Structure 1
Amino acid sequence: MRKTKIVCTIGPASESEEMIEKLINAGMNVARLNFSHGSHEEHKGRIDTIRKVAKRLDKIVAILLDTKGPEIRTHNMKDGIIELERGNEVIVSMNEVEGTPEKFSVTYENLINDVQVGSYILLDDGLIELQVKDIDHAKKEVKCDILNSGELKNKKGVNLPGVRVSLPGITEKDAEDIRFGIKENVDFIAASFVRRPSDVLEIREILEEQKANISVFPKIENQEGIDNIEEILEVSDGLMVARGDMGVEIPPEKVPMVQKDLIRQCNKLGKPVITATQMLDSMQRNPRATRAEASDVANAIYDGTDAVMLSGETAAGLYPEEAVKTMRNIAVSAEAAQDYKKLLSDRTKLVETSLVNAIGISVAHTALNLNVKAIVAATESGSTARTISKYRPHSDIIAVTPSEETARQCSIVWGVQPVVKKGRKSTDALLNNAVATAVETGRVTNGDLIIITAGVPTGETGTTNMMKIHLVGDEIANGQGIGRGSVVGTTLVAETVKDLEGKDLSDKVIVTNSIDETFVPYVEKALGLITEENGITSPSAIVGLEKGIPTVVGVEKAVKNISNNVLVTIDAAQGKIFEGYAN
């Protein structure tokens, strides 16, 4: 009962062995490392702090590396600062220059081939917005009308409202960053400013040289990216949705509409999605989030987000532990209050109806209708855990995996609580293990229903292809059942007809040797009946069937063996009796 995962950006305020512990405990599933800043030294240090604290507390926490990505900057400015009037003209040169309210240079020299007359250019994350008046490839200059006035520092950023920005997929830096990732077996890479499938593939070819197995999560920041969302997922292992980055190049009024649409588009293909940035940015300074932040976090989860990220709140903020705690809270809250029936019905239409998904569909329905405590998902890679996650069932998903690393990849998918048990070969071993693993988590006990799903045989496993429904043991008594119903109720072992005379409410299941004429008045008042020995037309049997009470005759030493007063559940079909609550 936790479901939506929490990604936390590690920083100064959270490097310590102490605070990493307190964050794992507050509910941190995935540690983010931002390579926009900081050296490989600093990062390698934190990776070790994380790995050790994690294996001490014995919890799966994954590592995510966020590439800095390609970008467009301003070359230094005269005096450092320089101003720009609100109705004037500025020249955007492709050759480096000192800054001036007239002449002014950018690090992306090819800008001039991407824009055109009338296109907008945004300086310093949208601080001041220009607009292209004319273009001379002669001088290689872009004359622009300054629309909103304001200042301009040196190495400040520039954004081109798509505009097929023609930067490469990855920096040379990025390429170095991501080789570092491969060296530390990091679990995720969050590729920045992705916009075409190429941009992802540039990272995947690097990974395939090393046969690295890392999941690759695009960061869709601009129109080109939004537009190519299907094609990008086609080639990607997940997805991030940074809204702060995205809000620059596209209007904030339009942003949530897109956020919804992206997350939807992930869920459709079962790719995990992270909603990122601007989540609880008040909690850097304060110890409790605003209402509109609490609202936005929740609406992420209502939009369908496998996970939720924290940037500065945990990195350099004043209150890291509190921001993690409060993140988990808002999650549990706005999940508590959501209708899994609609939710499932919704995904049943949304996701495609195909041989790959057949089981995800059956499992999710079966889980909802029979109220199963846990779906134990057996995975090598994790596809089965994600095939089950994507259909969003109330039941807690449990991913039993031999691969430690695929376990960490699971830590981000929705609803999946992963465990590492060692490889069984035979389907039979797979099934019995599952049932063991589910009980040893503690989330399931003897009463509960469990759905065991996996791809078998585990060798030729492509997709998940079988399910088993399983009661977690284990009939305390049994015999010949009469009737076909079932009930729960506290026992009342009766030696005599007078051993239940002036002390009888309903709501109990009576346990005698047989039924006389003197028992038949008392039986009808009761809930159930367990007679010791007998046959199908016996006095005990006939009186049960007739009065519509579920019973079981032919129970070995029922009076001696089964205890008095203990609550029990009988099942007419099967002819089994159980310890407490059953199904």
Structure 2
Amino acid sequence: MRKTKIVCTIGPASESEEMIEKLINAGMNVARLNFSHGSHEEHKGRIDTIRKVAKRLDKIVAILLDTKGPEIRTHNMKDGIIELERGNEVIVSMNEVEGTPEKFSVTYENLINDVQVGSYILLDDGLIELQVKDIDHAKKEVKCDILNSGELKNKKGVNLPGVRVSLPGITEKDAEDIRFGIKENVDFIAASFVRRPSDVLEIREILEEQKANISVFPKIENQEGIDNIEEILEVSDGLMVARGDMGVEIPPEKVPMVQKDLIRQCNKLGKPVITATQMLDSMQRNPRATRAEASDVANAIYDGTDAVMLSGETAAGLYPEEAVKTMRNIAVSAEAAQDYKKLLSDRTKLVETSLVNAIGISVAHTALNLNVKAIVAATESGSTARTISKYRPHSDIIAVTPSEETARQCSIVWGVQPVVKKGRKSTDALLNNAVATAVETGRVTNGDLIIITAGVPTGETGTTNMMKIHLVGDEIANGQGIGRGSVVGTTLVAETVKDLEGKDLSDKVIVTNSIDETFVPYVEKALGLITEENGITSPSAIVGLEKGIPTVVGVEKAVKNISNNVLVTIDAAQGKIFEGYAN
């Protein structure tokens, strides 16, 4: 019962074997490595630690590699710092220059081809905004009106509020960074500043060369990306919503509504979504998060995020463990109080009709109606686990897989708790393994209902194409059931009529030889009835059907075999009797 997965950025505060252990124990599911900073040397060092500490603690943690991305910086500035007055003008040179309140240079020389008169330009993560007055293609200079007078340090960022910014999909560095991911069988690549399908395909063509198999998760940080969200997902394995970065190009006021609609669009196609940045940022400095921050995280969950990400809190914060522990607690709480009927009801309408989704909706409704304890999803790739996870059911999801990487592919998916069991061949084994695996988790015992979905035969696999509903054994006794109902209650083995005379409340299922006239007054006071032998019109059978009591007759040696005062469940249809609570 945890559902929403926790991604953590590893940094100086949490390279430590000792600390990486604590974070894993505190719920970390995926390790982010941010390639904005650090050398391959450093990143490789942390990867080894995570692997090592993971397989000592015998836990499944994924590695996520976050690229730096293309960007539009300012070039160097004169005296290190430069100022810009508020009603004034500035010239943005496409050619490199030293910074002056008049002449001022940007690294993306092709800016002049993207903007036009009236377009806004933002500097130092939106610290001070400019606006395009004139464009001169001879001199290649863009003359602008300064608006929010502020200082300007050296290599500070520039943002053009969409504006089809025409950078490449990936930088040369990124291209080398992602081959380093390829080298370490890294699990996830979060791609930066994505904004058209091209930008992903560029990563995927580098992957397909080394037959890489890594999941690619775009970072949608501007309008062009928001606008192209469907076509990006078409080509992507998942998605990341960087709010901080987004809040520069599109107004803070509007971001939460945008966020909702992105997450929505991922839930639709069953792609995992990571909600990123500005989660618990005050826990770099403090040991507990502020209310405004807690609210934020919750809304992340209500909106429908497969996962939640900690940035600086864990990488270079004074409280990292606390940051993860807290992240978890908020998760569990925010989930506890939400309606899985609504959640389903929303997804039932939202997703499309397909062979694969048919089984999704079947397993969803069924799990909800029959109140199943666990859905065990047998997958080689992970797409079943996802097809089940998109419909968001209360039931715990269990992704049994033979692939150690696809296990880690699932650590980020909502609801799914993956185990790695060596593959069976035939369905009949597949099913029995499922049941085994379910129980060995401690998550289900004998009373419980389990639904087993998988893609058989497991050769072609591809789509998931079947489900079995399964009550986890295993009938204590059986015989001929009269009536169709059922109940639970503690036995009262009565060897004679006087063996239950003055010591009688309701709430019990009596276990006798047969029913006399002396038994018939006591039986109707009870909850159930099990009788030793008998047929269908017998005194024992007939009395149960008359007074609406679920009964079983012809029960081999009920008085000897069935114990006294032990809780039991009787099933009128089927004619089975169980160890204590079932369905």
When the two structures are superposed, what TM-score results if normalisation uses the length of structure 2?
Answer: 1.00
Report the CA distance between 1:436 and its aligned residue: 0.4
2:196 corresponds to: 196
In 1, the alpha carbon distance for the partners of 2:427 and 2:269 equals: 28
Report the CA distance between 1:543 and its aligned residue: 1.2
Report the CA distance between 1:445 and its aligned residue: 0.4
1:273 corresponds to: 273
In 2, the alpha carbon distance for the partners of 1:69 and 1:322 equals: 30
| CA shift digits 1:6-38 (9 cap, x unpaired) | 000000000000110100111000000000000
Q: What secondary structure does 2:166 align onto?
A: coil
- The alignment of Structure 1 onto Structure 2 pairs a total of residues equal to 583
| CA shift digits 1:384-430 (9 cap, x unpaired) | 00000000000000000000000000000100000000101101011
Structure 2 residue 563 is the aligned partner of structure 1 residue 577:
no
Report the CA distance between 1:545 and its aligned residue: 1.1
In 1, the alpha carbon distance for the partners of 2:42 and 2:129 equals: 36
Q: What secondary structure does 1:167 align onto?
A: coil
Q: What secondary structure does 2:308 align onto?
A: strand
1:481 corresponds to: 481
Q: What secondary structure does 2:218 align onto?
A: coil
In 2, the alpha carbon distance for the partners of 1:469 and 1:581 equals: 17
Deviates more, 1:350-359 or 1:295-304: 350-359
In 2, the alpha carbon distance for the partners of 1:547 and 1:130 equals: 85
Report the CA distance between 1:556 and its aligned residue: 1.2
| CA shift digits 1:454-475 (9 cap, x unpaired) | 1111112121110000001100
Report the CA distance between 1:517 and its aligned residue: 1.1
2:258 corresponds to: 258
In 1, the alpha carbon distance for the partners of 2:452 and 2:230 equals: 32
Report the CA distance between 1:356 and its aligned residue: 2.0
2:532 corresponds to: 532
In 2, the alpha carbon distance for the partners of 1:174 and 1:273 equals: 22
Q: What secondary structure does 1:453 align onto?
A: strand
Q: What secondary structure does 1:52 align onto?
A: helix
In 1, the alpha carbon distance for the partners of 2:474 and 2:52 equals: 40
Alpha-carbon RMSD: 0.5
Report the CA distance between 1:170 and its aligned residue: 0.2
Q: What secondary structure does 1:14 align onto?
A: coil
Unaligned 5+ segments in structure 2 are: none
In 2, the alpha carbon distance for the partners of 1:371 and 1:52 equals: 39
In 1, the alpha carbon distance for the partners of 2:82 and 2:436 equals: 68
Q: What secondary structure does 2:43 align onto?
A: helix
1:91 corresponds to: 91
Q: What secondary structure does 1:29 align onto?
A: strand
In 1, the alpha carbon distance for the partners of 2:198 and 2:29 equals: 29
In 2, the alpha carbon distance for the partners of 1:127 and 1:208 equals: 40
Q: What secondary structure does 1:145 align onto?
A: strand
Q: What secondary structure does 1:207 align onto?
A: helix
Report the CA distance between 1:42 and its aligned residue: 0.5
In 1, the alpha carbon distance for the partners of 2:195 and 2:276 equals: 17
Report the CA distance between 1:330 and its aligned residue: 0.6
In 1, the alpha carbon distance for the partners of 2:292 and 2:228 equals: 30
In 1, the alpha carbon distance for the partners of 2:524 and 2:162 equals: 78
Report the CA distance between 1:354 and its aligned residue: 1.6
Structure 2 residue 336 is the aligned partner of structure 1 residue 342:
no
Report the CA distance between 1:163 and its aligned residue: 0.4
| CA shift digits 1:237-289 (9 cap, x unpaired) | 00000000100111101110100000000000000000000100011100111
In 1, the alpha carbon distance for the partners of 2:377 and 2:78 equals: 61
Q: What secondary structure does 1:356 align onto?
A: helix
Q: What secondary structure does 1:216 align onto?
A: strand
In 2, the alpha carbon distance for the partners of 1:19 and 1:456 equals: 42
Report the CA distance between 1:544 and its aligned residue: 1.1
In 2, the alpha carbon distance for the partners of 1:257 and 1:510 equals: 60
Deviates more, 1:340-349 or 1:455-464: 455-464
Report the CA distance between 1:539 and its aligned residue: 1.3
In 1, the alpha carbon distance for the partners of 2:511 and 2:215 equals: 59
1:568 corresponds to: 568
| CA shift digits 1:204-250 (9 cap, x unpaired) | 00000011100000000000000000000000000000000100111
| CA shift digits 1:273-308 (9 cap, x unpaired) | 000001000111001111111001000100000000
Q: What secondary structure does 2:13 align onto?
A: helix
Report the CA distance between 1:573 and its aligned residue: 0.4
| CA shift digits 1:521-569 (9 cap, x unpaired) | 1101111011111111111111111111111111111100010000000
Q: What secondary structure does 1:240 align onto?
A: strand
Q: What secondary structure does 1:135 align onto?
A: strand
Q: What secondary structure does 2:177 align onto?
A: helix
Q: What secondary structure does 1:544 align onto?
A: helix
In 2, the alpha carbon distance for the partners of 1:121 and 1:463 equals: 47
2:305 corresponds to: 305
Q: What secondary structure does 1:302 align onto?
A: helix
Q: Which runs of 4+ in 1 moved over 3 A?
A: none
When the two structures are superposed, what TM-score results if normalisation uses the length of structure 1?
Answer: 1.00
Q: What secondary structure does 1:13 align onto?
A: coil
In 2, the alpha carbon distance for the partners of 1:353 and 1:451 equals: 21
| CA shift digits 1:89-131 (9 cap, x unpaired) | 1110011001101001111111100000010111110011111
Unaligned 5+ segments in structure 1 are: none
Report the CA distance between 1:158 and its aligned residue: 0.6
